[PDB]
């Protein structure tokens, strides 16, 4: 099953976190990252259409979100409000848009 991992799990304020995606399916139409534990629409972070590399920012897009063709998301300048869960929606041209949820925590330094 699609697995989302956060590396590192314990991020510090002022650093970046790489949300690695494991076991990615086929027939990829577009990746969509949302802020929460489910596939919403008003709380979308970013959508990335691999076919044309067409990336469109969502309402929750801060500008620190870097999406890769492997569906992994690298968020830089991590803040305390980043502590929580993140959900990925795998839009496929087969209706099965396999959803997965990951999470990470942030701690202050000095």
């Amino acid at each position: 099953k699609l697995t989302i991992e956060s590396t590192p799990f314990n991020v510090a304020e002022g650093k970046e976190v790489l949300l690695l995606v494991h076991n990615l399916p086929q027939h990829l139409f577009g990746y969509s990252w949302y802020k929460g534990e489910r596939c919403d629409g008003n709380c979308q972070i970013i959508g990335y259409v691999i076919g044309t590399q067409c990336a469109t920012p969502g309402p929750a897009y801060s500008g620190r979100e870097i999406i890769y063709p492997n569906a992994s998301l690298l968020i830089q300048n991590i803040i305390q409000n980043d502590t929580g869960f993140y959900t990925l929606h795998v839009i496929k041209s087969d209706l099965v848009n396999e959803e997965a949820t990951g999470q990470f925590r942030v701690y202050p330094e000095l």
């Binding site: 596939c39 919403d40 979308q44 920012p57 929606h89």
Partner: protein, 143 residues
């Protein structure tokens, strides 16, 4: 800068009977640029929209069926028989689907073209809609 909604074209083979009440026949990943305080709305082309209503038409222009474009359980949008729009402010980024109004009972299909254009909406009921962005021509083919 304006409320630009990117609607993509999609051709799929399906029957009118597969449309059982709410059946998402194809997930369209649509994202809206802008609209921080404006309502996002979907309106069909004038060839598929008459009297403030959206519908699909066949090659013989005899069979007319009304279809509502709703979110794939991603958000809450105001349903209208002509222009679909959400009351919630802010941009939108999810998947929309074409839903039939009332079971069609799989009436003899063929080739139906329904052009859906995205954009914004002003106020309510007055029909102040403006298609800005990309237009998506959805083709319904029976196979």
């Amino acid at each position: 800068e304006e409320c630009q909604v990117r609607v993509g074209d999609l051709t799929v083979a399906k029957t009118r009977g597969q449309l059982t009440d709410a059946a998402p026949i194809g997930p369209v990943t649509v994202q809206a640029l802008g609209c921080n305080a404006r309502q996002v709305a979907l309106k069909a082309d004038t060839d598929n929209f008459e009297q403030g209503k959206f519908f699909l038409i066949s090659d013989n222009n005899r069979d007319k069926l009304y279809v509502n474009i709703r979110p794939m359980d991603n958000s809450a949008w105001t349903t209208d028989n002509g222009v679909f729009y959400k009351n919630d402010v802010g941009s939108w980024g999810g998947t929309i689907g074409i839903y039939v109004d009332g079971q069609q009972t799989n009436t003899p299909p063929g080739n139906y073209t329904l052009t859906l254009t995205g954009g914004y909406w002003a106020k309510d009921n007055k029909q102040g809609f403006t298609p800005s962005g990309t237009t998506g021509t959805t083709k319904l083919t029976v196979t």
